[PDB]
Structures are given as C-alpha cells and as structure tokens.
Ligand binder design. Structure first.
Ligand SMILES: C[C@@H](N[C@@H](CCCNC(=N)N)C(=O)O)C(=O)O
Length: 255
C-alpha cells in the first residue's frame, strides 16, 4: 500500500524540529520520523509547515503525517487521529532568573489534571492569584494557550505565532512569564545562553495537556496509524527513543 509518505514539521520548535545553519530541518522529530519510516519500510520526506494551519493541511491532503512536537490533545482528537505517544513530558512555567515568582512555594510538584481534586484546584488557584498583574506569553494554538484561557482566565495572556518570539519577548522584558513542556524548557534553560531564564511551579500532566506527543494522521488512514504504532512500540522497546531523547533533550523523556 505505502511506498513513500510526506511528514510535516514546523521548523521553529527546538530541539524537536528546527533549522540548522544551512536551513535544513533537524531535531528529535526528524531523527525519529526517519527511524520510524525505515522500520515501516517506506520512504520519508519532511516538509516545512507553519504551526497555524498544520492540522487543516493534513486533512486537506497536502501531506500524510504530522511530527511537530504535537500533543495527543482531546480537542485535536476531534479533528485528526494520533499514533500511540512517542514521548511523555509534564508542562511547567518559565520566567527570568531575577523574578520573585521563583520564591513561590510549590505544594504539588507533580500535578495531574485528569480529575482535579479540591486540593489540586487550590494549587492552581494559588498560582492564578500570584499571576495577577503578570504578563503571560504562549504560542498560539497550543495546549498552553488552552490551559491559560480555561484554567487561568483572569491572567493576561499574549499569543505568538512561534515559541521563538515568546522567548525573545521574555528576554526583552515585554512579557513576565510563559508556559511550555519540560521537554522544551529544560534544553532551553540548560543552555549557558539562557542562564537568565528559569523553570518554576508544578509539573502538570493530563487534562488540556493531553496524553503525550504523537504522530498526527488523518482519521480514515487506519493502516498508516497501525504502521506508526508498530514502529513506535519497537523504537521504545529497543531504547531508540531513549537514545534520541538523551541526544536532543539531555534526559530520557521516552514513554
Ligand atoms: C510538546 C509540546 N506540545 C505543545 C506545543 C507544540 C508546539 N509545536 C510546534 N511549535 N512545532 C502542544 O501540543 O500544544 C509542548 O508542550 O511543548
């Protein structure tokens, strides 16, 4: 059935998918994608696609799959299908190294959002109250924007086309804080370039954040999903995902 597939990626989300000095698409998603396709015995072709319109371009048949740090989110599951997750990561807050937000006590380090108890709601509510007067910046069309608008609506938020513009505005002092996964924030804050940026708050999973990072596939492409699932299961089992995770993120984020 399948001989060759076209995989779309954004190219603005390091270390998942970004551009090298020669403008070539590189990253965890590119390496994993190529490895998965070798296992599936199909030719792999990566294409650049802006995050805004990545989902409708898949459904319109511009390409066959999405590998762009995309979380398996319930709102996304309404429109497209996903492979089983190839990476699992919590989500946390970002600010500057001199921010008093860093002095905030974290009562729940690992906060699941699937069935929010009064205790867990009290923790979210504390941060919402601390975030009053704090300017947030997030990338548009993310689980982070959904979380902020639904869980912390009283918080002032600005949405950006790319995560690079968020980071730029945070370093420039135009925004006070952000929200993204640990898989994005840890390699960012590990860089000596960004020793003036720090992660803080609970490490949140589930709810609006979804079930992990997966390959976006059209709902009617059941055979392609089944092929990706087989390949992902094997890449996890043999330690390939762990290897690529350590190589790109500096830690093991494999399921
Ligand atoms: C793993 C990644 N997932 C987010 C952000 C994805 C942004 N991807 C991109 N710009 N290519 C989401 O699915 O909404 C994150 O939380 O950090």
């Amino acid at each position: 059935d399948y001989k060759s597939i076209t995989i779309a990626t954004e190219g603005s989300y390091a270390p998942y998918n970004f551009k090298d000095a020669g403008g070539k698409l590189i990253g965890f998603d590119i390496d994993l994608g190529n490895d998965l396709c070798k296992r599936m015995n199909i030719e792999c072709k990566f294409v650049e696609q802006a995050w805004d319109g990545i989902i409708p371009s898949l459904t319109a048949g511009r390409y066959d799959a999405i590998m762009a740090a995309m979380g398996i989110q319930p709102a996304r599951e309404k429109v497209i299908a996903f492979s089983r997750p190839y990476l699992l990561t919590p989500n946390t807050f970002l600010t500057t190294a001199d921010s008093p937000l860093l002095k905030t006590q974290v009562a729940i380090e690992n906060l699941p959002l699937d069935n929010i108890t009064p205790e867990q709601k009290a923790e979210l509510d504390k941060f919402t109250k601390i975030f009053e007067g704090v300017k947030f910046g997030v990338q548009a069309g993310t689980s982070h924007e959904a979380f902020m608008k639904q869980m912390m609506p009283s918080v002032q938020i600005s949405t950006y086309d790319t995560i690079d513009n968020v980071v730029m505005d945070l370093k420039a002092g135009r925004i006070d804080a952000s929200l993204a996964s640990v898989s994005f924030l840890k390699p960012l804050t590990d860089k000596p370039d960004n020793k003036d940026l720090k992660m803080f708050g609970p490490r949140m999973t589930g709810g609006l954040f979804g079930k992990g990072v997966g390959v976006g596939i059209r709902k009617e492409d059941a055979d392609l999903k089944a092929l990706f699932d087989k390949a992902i299961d094997a890449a996890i089992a043999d330690g390939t995902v762990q290897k690529l995770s350590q190589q790109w993120f500096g830690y093991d984020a494999s399921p």
